Design an enzyme around this catalytic site. Structure first.
Site, PDB file in Angstrom:
ATOM      1  N   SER A 115      -0.788 -12.367  -1.850  1.00 21.83           N
ATOM      2  CA  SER A 115      -0.875 -13.481  -0.904  1.00 21.83           C
ATOM      3  C   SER A 115      -1.339 -12.997   0.471  1.00 21.83           C
ATOM      4  CB  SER A 115       0.430 -14.268  -0.896  1.00 21.83           C
ATOM      5  OG  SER A 115       0.667 -14.751  -2.215  1.00 21.83           O
ATOM      6  N   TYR A 116      -0.539 -13.124   1.527  1.00 24.61           N
ATOM      7  CA  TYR A 116      -0.984 -12.592   2.838  1.00 24.61           C
ATOM      8  C   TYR A 116      -1.296 -11.090   2.704  1.00 24.61           C
ATOM      9  CZ  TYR A 116      -1.375 -12.805   8.007  1.00 24.61           C
ATOM     10  OH  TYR A 116      -1.824 -12.810   9.313  1.00 24.61           O
TER      11      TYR A 116
END
Ligand code: CL
Ligand code: CL
Ligand code: CL
Ligand code: CL
Ligand code: CL
Ligand code: CL
Ligand code: CL
Ligand code: CL
Ligand code: CL
Ligand code: CL
Ligand code: NA
Ligand code: NA
Lengths: 574, 574
Positions: A115-116
């Site tokens: 994700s991030y």
């Protein structure tokens, strides 16, 4: 052998003098080693929070890799000010440069994470640092407009924005030097958002966010205030630079993950110039168990963290340690094929022999509701018809499963029956299948539409109807009509005029088994996955509910208006 | 500060010469330190698998504790032969002794961990090792008959047994020196059990387990073959020794966790002689998210791993580091009170002012099904009645939520409506409540029953009926009639005779809010949470389905047979 050490809060200077904190996991044996970097906005100390969605990466350290976990700028042990995305290219470049200078680095660096922690890898990859030999972005995107904040259809992913902002806000407050009197109350209000994201998203005007706008001004200043895919978005987009890279990438995605369309697009962008790998499971961003309320994929579907660790190590052994046979027997692409509910290896994505096949909307009478007359067929419909409904922004169609991130984001393959009785949900189904039909690939719709309004949305959702009546969501998309031709330079529509519009429905892999039906739902809302169109042509996020308008919307179907879904058909007999 | 090292596969000799493997996480600073031990049968290397259900325990290492994680005998890096439970007292004693001898140990040792990693702590605590200053058993039991393998009612927890055995079997095979030709096929069959635990549990005779009995003979030799709480079970039971200990224990439990009754009983056993703490959340063994298919408890209900870490560190600081004020402001007991869905601090468990209140079964007509006439009232029923049903072992009542471990063990607060139409499910409800009623404590039923058979089971389940019709399970139990008076020396019943029997329904904490009803379901099966009674008086696990019998079972209710549930009522006005 195996033995390692962990050094806490080593300060790494960025080009502007601000120092980011890292933890160093270093093998005890002498001599420099290959190094893996993770850039994390959720506290580098908190390894258990994210690692179960990634890899058993201590195995990498035990096997002789150093691992560096960094607090991003302005969070936890790092100095500076946090703003999403805008500092990560430069800070990654400077961090990679620092790693490469160290006594314990042998000149080979990689990255991994989800994700991030995946997006930050694309930002690193475009830096031009030769020492970066491979990345492994899981659940990631190289175009932040397209995922996770808006989408290819030009609607704001409002639950994604408010949920993530509330989460980061909780972190921003925890990161504080010194506790403030208002902190306790702010925590309570952030929790209230996270317990009721649809409620939070229902406030109007959307752009008035007293709590979130104070804690993280970016929420409004960047995201809500820039609905067009304008210069502000291009400045953080990596996607156009991906084609010029020659960096191996091990890309993981999930069929019900908010980033899936963009994750898959990164694979397609990089596969020709470097060794790219793809793994796609049936997961959503908060549920990698393979188990959902009305759909179980089997224990094999549970995020295979051991196998993922083995594959990552093989990948890094090839590209960071020059072990030329390290990826022997490892497939290029590995997909969890739903329906049959089995992992399957492939040689490419899209699959080589994909037949992009139109399934046309048809039927006698109105297609409104699941008990209407709506059909799907590979044959063009013989008679001109139109299905009509009222779309009222005060009563949007609720989001159920799909690629929700924070609002009920743990039930991707959700049963759609709760919304089947709605007059604004148009349903079109095949006959009950006697032979299996595999749909594996990117999915889109081409609809002939008209509206009483100068702007509105149209949605399309692909659904697998089971023998017992469960109507399981597979993939979906939206088109916001002002962006029907371009996300950059929107124009309004003329009321009553018929437009042929494309809806990007991301991707899936599903075998519709005998006894099932293929179904498509068409509507004009899907809230809070996407914000509601006001049907005014105005600045949607700045409008009060009471100044929004209803729209009478129309789907045209027939020989001169052959509305259809394009299914990526895979036929395998062997 | 913060910095530490990790030493892999340090071999620790047991009294019989067999060496167990440990990993040592040791602060880099000089001087001996307090030490925490975790004894793990699921690979000491695989820290991410269990730690998210426990603590961010690297914080302990960063704060100056050493942590030792051990592979139990016969698994992964350890020598010897694995058999559940039987070696853990001695191996813990010898491991603690070894730790206390080391240069880096300051004479203070503690333990923490969950489930098997919790049970092993009670086994350590009875060793008499003075250097063990505190334990923190989460989701644990000190009586393996009572949890997880059988129960206070004397029925086999068949899904728990087959699921855990399949899981360990997968580990036993992975632990292998050298891969065997049959391994691949064995993996496939183990996966088939885990994907369909009820199917696995339905085979008869139950005791014939070709796969599991080969991989882990204990499954049959100990568990299935000893249905009575006999000498074999007493030999591994710790419970009677707990009263004599003076060891601080930080005990965690979950309302829908298989171990809950026994976890809570350990708190009651040790609280008078040492500093005991209790934390109980609304979790099941595989779901600590606070989110379920038809019941959401809020984000506050998510296993609070940060707060748990802080509390554990405070607890160990008090008891291992002699910091006398370290637990200032920390409550003795902290419960997640369902309904209101809030954490609440208490001074004791059971709660001090608990009113153990009978709610009597009554009603006009038959109580069969949710649309029958069954009532609950604090007043004794005025007329003698009886509800009758046929219990057929070939069609048991399916388990739905509750304290399931492996068969659908992720939906504790399950909606019971799918089984409400069954004639063998007797339902008794209060009127719709106008004022809240809190039930927090241990729960039991006293039923007057009769059967056409010489043995059978009776079950009771407490349920919260919501305004929308959801009938949410809270807690349940069973009594196997041959064990109605004793788990040790069973005797059969006489057909047609009325018996007053107790059903231990474990514990709960729930406020039944206005608009809700309190409901009890009574039946004679709950499969595969518990194995099915054959209604023959025979050796149940050795019987074929076709040699089992149906039973006509009866619940008597009225002035001379005042069947009731005893609810632990808490009334709070302040
Ligand atoms: Cl299913
Ligand atoms: Cl499976
Ligand atoms: Cl598979
Ligand atoms: Cl037609
Ligand atoms: Cl079905
Ligand atoms: Cl709820
Ligand atoms: Cl909450
Ligand atoms: Cl709370
Ligand atoms: Cl009565
Ligand atoms: Cl309700
Ligand atoms: Na993805
Ligand atoms: Na428990």
């Amino acid at each position: 052998d195996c033995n390692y050490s962990v050094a806490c809060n080593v300060m790494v200077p960025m080009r502007d003098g601000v120092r980011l904190a890292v933890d160093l996991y270093r093998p005890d044996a002498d001599g420099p080693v290959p190094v893996l970097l993770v850039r994390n906005p959720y506290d580098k100390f908190d390894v258990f929070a994210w690692s179960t969605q990634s890899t058993n990466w201590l195995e990498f350290v035990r096997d002789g890799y150093a691992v560096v976990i960094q607090d991003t700028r302005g969070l936890f042990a790092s100095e500076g000010e946090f703003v999403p995305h805008v500092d990560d290219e430069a800070d990654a470049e400077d961090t990679l440069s620092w790693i490469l200078e160290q006594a314990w680095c042998d000149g080979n660096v990689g990255m991994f994470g989800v994700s991030y922690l995946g997006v930050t890898q694309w930002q690193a990859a475009v830096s031009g640092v030769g020492g970066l030999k491979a990345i492994a972005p899981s659940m990631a995107s190289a175009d932040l407009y397209r995922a996770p904040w808006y989408g290819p259809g030009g609607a704001l992913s409002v639950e994604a924005l408010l949920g993530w902002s509330a989460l980061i806000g909780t972190g921003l407050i925890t990161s504080r030097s010194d506790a403030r009197p208002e902190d306790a109350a702010d925590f309570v209000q952030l929790a209230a958002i996270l317990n009721d994201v649809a409620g939070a998203a229902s406030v109007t005007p959307l752009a008035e966010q007293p709590l979130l706008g104070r804690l993280i001004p970016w929420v409004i200043d960047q995201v809500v205030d820039h609905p067009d895919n304008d210069e502000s978005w291009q400045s953080i987009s990596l996607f156009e630079r991906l084609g010029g890279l020659a960096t191996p990438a091990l890309i993981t995605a999930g069929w019900y993950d908010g980033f899936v369309g963009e994750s898959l697009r990164t694979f397609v962008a990089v596969k020709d110039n470097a060794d790219a790998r793809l793994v796609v499971g049936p997961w959503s961003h908060s549920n990698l168990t393979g188990r959902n309320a009305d759909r179980k994929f089997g224990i094999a579907a549970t995020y295979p963290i051991q196998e993922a660790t083995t594959m990552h190590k093989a990948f890094f052994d090839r590209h960071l340690r020059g072990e030329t046979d390290a990826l022997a027997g490892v497939p290029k692409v590995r997909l969890f094929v739903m329906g049959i509910d089995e992992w399957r290896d492939e040689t490419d994505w899209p699959l080589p022999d994909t037949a992009y096949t139109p399934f046309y909307l048809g039927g006698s009478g109105a297609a409104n509701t699941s008990t209407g007359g709506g059909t799907l067929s590979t044959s063009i419909s013989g008679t001109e018809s139109a299905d009509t409904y009222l779309y009222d922004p005060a009563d949007p169609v609720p989001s159920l499963g799909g690629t929700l991130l924070f609002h009920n984001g743990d039930n991707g393959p959700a049963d759609q029956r709760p919304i089947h009785d709605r007059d604004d949900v148009l349903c079109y189904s095949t006959e009950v299948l006697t032979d299996p039909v595999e749909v594996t690939g990117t999915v889109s719709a081409r609809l002939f539409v008209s509206s009483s309004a100068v702007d509105t949305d149209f949605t399309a959702k692909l659904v697998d109807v089971f023998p017992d009546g469960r109507a399981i969501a597979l993939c979906d998309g939206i088109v916001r009509m002002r962006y029907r031709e371009t996300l950059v330079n929107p124009t309004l529509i003329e009321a009553g005029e018929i437009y042929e519009v494309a809806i990007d429905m991301l991707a899936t892999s599903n075998v519709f088994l005998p006894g099932h039906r293929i179904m498509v739902q068409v509507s004009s809302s899907n809230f809070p996955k996407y914000d509601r169109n006001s049907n005014t042509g105005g600045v949607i996020a700045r409008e009060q509910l009471e100044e929004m308008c209803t729209a009478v919307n129309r789907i045209h179907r027939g020989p001169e208006h052959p509305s259809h879904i394009v299914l990526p058909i895979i036929k395998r007999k062997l």
